[PDB]
């Protein structure tokens, strides 16, 4: 199926405490595989997935130097945005960037993207065309004009269609045993009493990969999505994910509800009852 390469970058200033903290975290699909943290003793790009041991010393040195260069660029941006927004030098501010590309099963580009945020709000983003930018406010409009005059879109497009895609294919090839695997969900239902002759039925899906999954509760053959409570799919600490979805039902009528689990690792969806 399709796969993605994403980098989550965060720069946070801290007036009075020295230089801003700078972090870069990379993911291939839903798996963290590399990380850079300026607050580490000796900041360096580091592998976060076992298969990255396949990259030689040059890779780590190159990514580390690039990260330090990016860190310096963001230090400048934090200062620049204080000016654009006419803010004080004593407050903490955050810049966030998500950059990435997605390819189909054949390794060809599906889409690329790069979006910026300042203090948790949209700042500027590359449009789907990979040619123009969309600015959220007048400060971002200044940036948009600067980048157009410098031809930044063309440079970024080259990265997205070329560098990003090519590295993603390489990571998928080297880490195939991990990234192309399928771990089937194991499910179970828990029961909890409530006041007013009602019960909470919670359906759990554990140890699966990839992260995409669908959990629904049914009654009489119809789904109860609007009556369900749930948590966003979440990492379980070992590279797998988990999720739960619950519904409140009448005491004594539990046997009438069924949990359905759909996943890449389930040739036939699972159907469970309490």
């Amino acid at each position: 199926g399709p796969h993605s390469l994403r980098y989550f970058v965060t720069a946070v200033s801290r007036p009075g405490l020295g230089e801003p903290r700078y972090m870069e975290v990379g993911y291939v699909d839903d798996t963290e595989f590399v990380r850079f943290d300026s607050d580490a003793e000796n900041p360096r790009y580091e592998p976060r997935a076992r298969w990255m041991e396949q990259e030689g010393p040059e890779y780590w040195e190159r990514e580390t130097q690039k990260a330090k260069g990016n860190e310096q660029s963001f230090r400048v941006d934090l200062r620049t945005l204080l000016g654009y927004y006419n803010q004080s030098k004593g407050g903490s501010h955050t810049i966030q960037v998500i950059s990435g590309c997605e390819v189909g099963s054949d390794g060809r580009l599906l889409r690329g993207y790069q979006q910026y945020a300042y203090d948790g709000c949209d700042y500027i983003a590359l449009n789907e065309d990979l040619k123009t930018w969309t600015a959220a406010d007048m400060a971002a409009l200044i940036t948009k004009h600067k980048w157009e005059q410098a031809g930044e879109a063309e440079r970024l497009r080259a990265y997205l269609e070329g560098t990003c895609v090519e590295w993603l294919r390489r990571y998928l090839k080297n880490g195939n045993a991990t990234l192309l695997r399928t771990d089937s969900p194991k499910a179970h239902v828990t029961h909890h009493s409530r006041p007013e002759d009602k019960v909470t039925l919670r359906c759990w899906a554990l140890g699966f990969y990839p992260a995409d999954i669908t959990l629904t509760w049914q009654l009489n053959g119809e789904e109860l999505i609007q009556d369900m409570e749930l948590v966003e799919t979440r990492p379980a600490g070992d590279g797998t994910f988990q999720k739960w979805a619950s519904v409140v039902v009448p005491l004594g009528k539990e046997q009438y509800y069924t949990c359905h689990v759909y996943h890449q690792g389930l040739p036939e969806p699972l159907t469970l009852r309490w």
């Binding site: 970058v9 990260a67 950059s99 990003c164």
Partner: peptide, 8 residues
């Protein structure tokens, strides 16, 4: 490999 980012 992450992209190189430049000043806004």
């Amino acid at each position: 490999s992450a992209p190189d980012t430049r000043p806004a």
